[PDB]
Structure formats: structure tokens, C-alpha cells
Amino acid sequence: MTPGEELFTGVVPILVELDGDVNGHKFSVSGEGEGDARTGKLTLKFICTTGKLPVPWPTLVTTFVQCFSRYPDHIRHHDFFKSAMPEGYVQERVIVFKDDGAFVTRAEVKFEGDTLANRIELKGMNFKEDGWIMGHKLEYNYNSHNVYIEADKEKNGIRVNFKIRLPLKDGGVLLADHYQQNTPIGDGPVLLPDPHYLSTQSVLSKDPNETRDHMVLLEFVTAAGIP
Amino acid sequence: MTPGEELFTGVVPILVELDGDVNGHKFSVSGEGEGDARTGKLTLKFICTTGKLPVPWPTLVTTFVQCFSRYPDHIRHHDFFKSAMPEGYVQERVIVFKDDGAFVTRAEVKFEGDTLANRIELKGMNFKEDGWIMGHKLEYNYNSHNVYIEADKEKNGIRVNFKIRLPLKDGGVLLADHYQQNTPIGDGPVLLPDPHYLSTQSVLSKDPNETRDHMVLLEFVTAAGIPL
Numbered sequence: 001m002t003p004g005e006e007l008f009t010g011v012v013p014i015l016v017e018l019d020g021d022v023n024g025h026k027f028s029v030s031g032e033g034e035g036d037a038r039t040g041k042l043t044l045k046f047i048c049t050t051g052k053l054p055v056p057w058p059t060l061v062t063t064f065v066q067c068f069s070r071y072p073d074h075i076r077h078h079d080f081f082k083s084a085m086p087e088g089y090v091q092e093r094v095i096v097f098k099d100d101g102a103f104v105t106r107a108e109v110k111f112e113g114d115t116l117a118n119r120i121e122l123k124g125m126n127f128k129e130d131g132w133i134m135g136h137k138l139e140y141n142y143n144s145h146n147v148y149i150e151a152d153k154e155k156n157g158i159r160v161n162f163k164i165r166l167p168l169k170d171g172g173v174l175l176a177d178h179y180q181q182n183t184p185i186g187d188g189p190v191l192l193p194d195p196h197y198l199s200t201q202s203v204l205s206k207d208p209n210e211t212r213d214h215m216v217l218l219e220f221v222t223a224a225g226i227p
Numbered sequence: 228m229t230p231g232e233e234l235f236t237g238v239v240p241i242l243v244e245l246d247g248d249v250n251g252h253k254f255s256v257s258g259e260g261e262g263d264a265r266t267g268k269l270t271l272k273f274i275c276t277t278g279k280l281p282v283p284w285p286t287l288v289t290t291f292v293q294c295f296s297r298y299p300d301h302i303r304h305h306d307f308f309k310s311a312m313p314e315g316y317v318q319e320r321v322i323v324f325k326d327d328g329a330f331v332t333r334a335e336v337k338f339e340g341d342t343l344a345n346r347i348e349l350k351g352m353n354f355k356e357d358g359w360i361m362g363h364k365l366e367y368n369y370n371s372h373n374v375y376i377e378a379d380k381e382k383n384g385i386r387v388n389f390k391i392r393l394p395l396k397d398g399g400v401l402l403a404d405h406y407q408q409n410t411p412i413g414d415g416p417v418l419l420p421d422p423h424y425l426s427t428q429s430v431l432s433k434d435p436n437e438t439r440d441h442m443v444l445l446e447f448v449t450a451a452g453i454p455l
Contacts, residue, residue, distance in 0.1 A: 023379070023381055023382070024379070024381035024382040025381065092352060094321055094323070094329045094331060094352065096321070096323055096329075096404075101406065102321045102323075102406045104321060104331055123319075125319065125321065125386075125406050125407075125408045126386050126388055126406045126407070126408065129381075152250075152251075154250055154251035154252070154356075155250070155251040159352075159353050161353055177323075179328065179329050179352055179353045180353070181352050181353065
């Protein structure tokens with residue numbers, strides 16, 4: 001086990017902060033919660049601090065900490081995400097929404113004191129202004145996914161490509177293609193893995209006492225397919 | 228006609244600089260040439276100054292100055308690109324190669340003295356290291372396309388989208404979707420167009436005497452699709 005992996009033996013507080021600009025509409029989101037990598041369980045709550053979120057909450061779930069995946073403790077494995085800690089990793093995505101616009105995101109995931117922090121900047125371009133995203137036509141729900149991890153030896157990190165199906169309020173799905181790379185922030189050695197996948201299930205809900213625009217997230221993340 | 232449009236009555240020298248990183252392979256490209264917006268004609272030559280270019284030249288053509296498009300009289304009032312001059316505009320793209328990786332680019336296009344300068348940063352992610360791009364399976368050749376332009380009134384700029392077909396050596400094409408946004412650098416007024424398109428044609432060639440990895444580009448671009 002690496003020292004980074006051992007930072008996750010307990011339940012770790014999480015902070016998320018996102019600065020976003022979609023079709024010129026600027027917005028910010030703060031999140032708070034905690035993660036238990038022993039079980040793969042994450043609880044997170046997000047509040048749009050700038051007023052109404054200009055995109056549907058489900059389009060941001062993947063952007064809002066895969067270092068909390070449950071990896072099998074008694075099977076040999078390389079956990080890139082935890083082993084990069086505490087100095088952390090940069091997580092970059094392009095997300096392409098079919099027949100709509102694209103997100104470009106850059107995030108730093110690292111310890112700040114005792115807290116695992118995910119700090120993101122997001123740029124959205126070419127969204128249809130009365131389309132499914134800008135028009136808030138997505139159902140407030142979320143599907144489970146398998147996402148396949150592979151080593152990126154040239155960048156001493158990992159790459160991930162995966163498809164998300166976002167259900168529409170009135171029936172149908174919006175496909176969202178995710179292109180992801182993760183690279184360590186520090187100089188020290190990191191674990192690069194054999195190909196495997198992370199299995200994610202997520203439950204979205206609301207707090208009746210929170211009048212701000214917000215999202216309550218419960219998530220389970222488990223590694224598998226480990227050669 | 229705006230003062231920025233009038234900076235293009237003659238033949239304007241062009242400088243291009245690109246700072247790139249694809250799958251961790253860093254590379255730089257310098258270009259020089261000139262543009263004639265009266266006819267829509269561009270001539271540019273690019274030299275990889277870091278050695279071998281790690282992607283095929285055709286994948287970079289769109290990244291390497293739409294202010295040289297020929298806007299006819301009936302639609303000059305739609306010419307955002309020239310009206311932003313001389314202070315210029317930022318051009319941002321996401322480019323998605325079908326079943327391959329993505330480029331993310333940001334460029335500043337502006338006059339530097341009497342030269343029109345395109346200065347670009349490019350980052351490419353998730354390319355298959357044995358796919359058509361990284362394995363250099365694209366034909367050194369180029370197709371004719373339509374570039375769709377609309378006003379982005381929220382950002383005082385324009386939104387641009389189009390699909391390029393990159394020819395493959397053994398036949399067929401690799402599709403590349405372009406998501407584009409342009410916003411002025413300065414604060415003064417710009418022309419916000421009605422929806423229209425640019426029609427493009429390009430020819431790629433080589434200089435037998437240039438030992439460095441390079442591309443010679445001839446390009447013709449004309450605006451069309453006049454909404455009354």
C-alpha cells in the first residue's frame with residue numbers, strides 16, 4: 001500500500017468548487033461531503049452560489065473524485081488516484097453532448113489540510129440556447145455506468161473514455177461522450193494500472209429545507225475487472 | 228464598411244505560431260504567408276521547428292484566419308472577423324475526431340503592426356496510439372467544406388460549427404467535428420451577423436527544397452447563404 005492509499009483508511013471530508021461559463025453565463029457551485037474508500041461510498045451536497053444553475057444538475061455529476069473508489073484490498077492492484085495523494089492529480093475532460101454543445105473542464109484533486117479538494121474550471125461552448133441543456137429538459141435522475149481506465153504511459157497518468165446517457169424529461173436520452181485524462185501534480189512516483197473499470201451508481205435527491213438551487217448526491221464507486 | 232474591414236483591401240502579410248501538446252508529445256509550428264480578402268485567397272507555409280510533427284499536417288489546417296474570407300457586397304455587414312480588427316479576436320475550438328481523440332485550442336488573431344498574426348495553443352487528449360492520427364494514416368490532401376456561423380449575442384461574438392472530412396490514405400475519410408467560438412479582444416463595436424456560412428477549398432503541397440517537416444497551403448474561402 002502506498003502512503004497516498006493509506007490517507008483513505010478513514011472517512012475523508014470532501015470540498016468541491018466549480019467556476020463555470022456556459023454560453024457566456026457565469027456560475028459557481030460549492031460542494032461539501034465526505035468519502036469512505038473502504039466501502040466506495042460518497043455523500044456530497046452542491047449549492048449554486050450565483051443563483052439558478054444555467055445547466056441541468058445531471059450534466060455536472062461527472063465533473064463534481066475517483067480516488068474514493070473501493071479497490072479490492074487483498075488483490076494486487078495499482079490505484080493511480082489514491083497513490084497520487086496528497087499532492088494530487090489534474091483531471092481534464094472534454095464532454096460532448098450529442099447534437100448540442102461541449103464542456104471543457106480542468107480540475108485539481110488534492111489534499112488541502114485534512115480535506116480532499118476537487119477544484120474545477122469549466123467552459124461550455126456552442127450550446128443550443130433552447131436545446132435540452134440550456135432549456136432544462138433533462139430528468140433529475142442518474143444512471144449507473146462502467147468506466148474503463150487505462151494507463152497513459154506517455155503522460156505518466158491514465159486515460160478514460162466513456163458514454164453517459166442522460167434521460168430527458170419528456171422521454172429519450174442525451175448522449176454525453178467523455179474524454180478524460182489524469183496526470184499527477186507532484187514529482188514522486190505514481191502507480192500506473194493495468195486496464196480495469198470503475199463501476200458507479202448514483203442517486204440524486206433534494207433537501208426540502210434548502211431553498212437555494214442544489215443537488216444531494218449519493219454515490220458508490222467500485223473497481224473491478226482487475227487483471 | 229468598418230475601419231477593420233478596410234484594413235483588408237490590399238494583400239496583408241500573415242504570421243502563425245502554434246504551441247502544441249498531443250498525447251504528451253510537445254511540438255511548435257511557425258507559419259508565414261499572406262491573405263487577399265478581395266478574392267478570398269490565402270497562401271501560407273508552415274514549418275515544424277521542433278522536428279517531426281507528431282500528428283498529420285491535415286489535422287492542423289483549420290487551427291492554422293477567417294478574416295481573409297471573401298464577403299460579397301450583399302453580406303459584408305455580417306463580417307465579424309474583420310470588424311474586430313485591428314485589436315482582434317479570440318478563437319476557441321474543441322475538435323472531435325470520430326472514434327479518436329479531441330483537440331482543444333485557443334488562439335488570438337490580431338494585427339501586430341501591419342501583419343495579421345494568429346497565435347495558438349493546442350492540447351490534444353485521448354488519441355489512440357495505433358489509430359489513424361498517431362499512426363499517420365491520413366492522406367496529405369484536403370476537402371472542401373461549409374463553415375456555419377451565427378451570432379452569439381450573449382458573448383458579443385459568434386458561434387461556428389462544421390464537420391471536416393480528412394482523407395485517409397487507403398480511401399474514405401476521418402470525420403472531425405469543430406465546435407468554435409469567437410469573441411472580440413477589444414471593447415469597441417463589432418458586426419454581429421445573421422446565420423450564414425463560408426465555403427472553403429484548400430490545396431496542400433510540399434517544397435522539394437525544405438528539409439524540415441512542413442506544409443504549403445493554398446486556400447480559397449467565400450461567404451455565402453445571405454439571409455436577404
